[PDB]
Design a protein around this ligand. Structure first.
Ligand code: NA
Length: 347
């Protein structure tokens, strides 16, 4: 039962997207009249609406994607619009395609990508998780935010070993605490207009917070965009230790707090760009010789499905869906190994 006020907003949002002749978002590309009418009168069990999916791309016509998920069920219920957007962004993950089961693989096949520290400044592996049972940030209530922070911060306080550390709520955070976290690049702020128009910043900063371990090789953002953004990083290129530290953390959390995961799509996230493995494995790396070639580099990036973002690059795996967590990490590993091999043999 979707109320008339929402239907009126949905109709004006649809028409505004049509009238924007300039607009290149995936939302505009696939929200035709047939899809719109398939979706406009549906509502999820937790109460989410099509407007709770598309408002941010309606308000921000310069959005690249322009759709977000207000809860886990929205991906299936509003599948007529998510499915073509998902296929396009993830380049070939079709509506009938299926994401494999979670598999972190054999960690002993993961290596230090640059033992000498000659090239790789730092390595990062990042994932995201939504907690089963809660709305996503478009639809969390204030009480939801508080209870989740309670549960999650409680779990964080039981981390032992290399994961031992401290939770910092954004609520009541003082300016000195803020600065020390900024200095570490650990702080996040209020979201930009895309997140604002998606209703992902309500009740700010209730339920938002930051966890890191004493060694500062492990970071979690609570309700920055997803319920959890879990990151493992360190200087150099020991991908093995980094990935193993991440999977230990994820497993620990899961043992106390189930994740929202879909058979077809993998782990469900607020942005559909982060589905599947959710995994972004990256290195900060200097390839000066390959920077003077630029033709041999992208031959490797494109061949190993890496995205390349002077001399010092941030290089990360492009694929999130259709491959396992292991294969994503192994793909980054193999690509970086090859590029360093090319760098070492270059002129
Ligand atoms: Na970071």
């Amino acid at each position: 039962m979707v109320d008339q006020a929402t239907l009126d907003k949905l109709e004006a949002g649809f028409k505004k997207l049509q009238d924007a002749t300039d607009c290149k978002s995936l939302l505009k590309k696939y929200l035709n009249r047939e899809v719109f009418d398939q979706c406009k009168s549906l509502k999820t069990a937790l109460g989410a609406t099509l407007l709770d999916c598309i408002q941010s791309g309606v308000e921000n016509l310069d959005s690249g994607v322009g759709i977000y998920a207000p809860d886990a069920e929205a991906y299936t219920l509003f599948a007529p619009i998510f499915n073509p957007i998902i296929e396009d962004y993830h380049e070939g993950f079709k509506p009938t395609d299926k994401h494999p089961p979670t598999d972190f693989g054999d960690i002993n096949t993961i290596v230090n990508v640059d033992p000498s520290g000659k090239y790789v400044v730092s390595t990062h592996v990042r994932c995201g998780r939504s907690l089963k049972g809660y709305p996503f940030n478009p639809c969390l209530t204030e009480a939801n935010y508080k209870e989740m922070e309670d549960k999650v911060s409680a779990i964080f306080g039981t981390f032992e070993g290399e994961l031992k550390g401290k939770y910092y709520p954004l609520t009541g955070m003082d300016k000195a605490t803020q600065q020390q976290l900024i200095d570490d690049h650990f702080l996040f702020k209020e979201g930009d207009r895309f997140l604002q128009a998606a209703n992902a910043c309500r009740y700010w900063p209730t339920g938002r917070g930051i966890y890191h371990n004493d060694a500062k090789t492990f970071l979690v953002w609570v309700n920055e965009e997803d319920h959890l953004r879990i990151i493992s990083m360190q200087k150099g290129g020991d991908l093995k230790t980094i990935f193993q530290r991440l999977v230990n953390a994820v497993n620990t959390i899961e043992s106390k707090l189930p994740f929202s995961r879909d058979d077809r799509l993998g782990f469900l996230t607020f942005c559909p760009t982060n589905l599947g493995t959710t995994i972004r494995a990256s290195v900060h790396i200097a390839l000066p010789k390959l920077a003077k070639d630029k033709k041999q580099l992208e031959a490797i990036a494109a061949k190993f499905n890496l995205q390349v973002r002077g001399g010092v690059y941030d290089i990360s795996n492009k694929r999130r869906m259709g491959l396992t967590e292991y294969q994503a990490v192994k793909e980054m590993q193999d690509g970086i190994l090859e590029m360093i091999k090319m760098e070492e043999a270059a002129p």
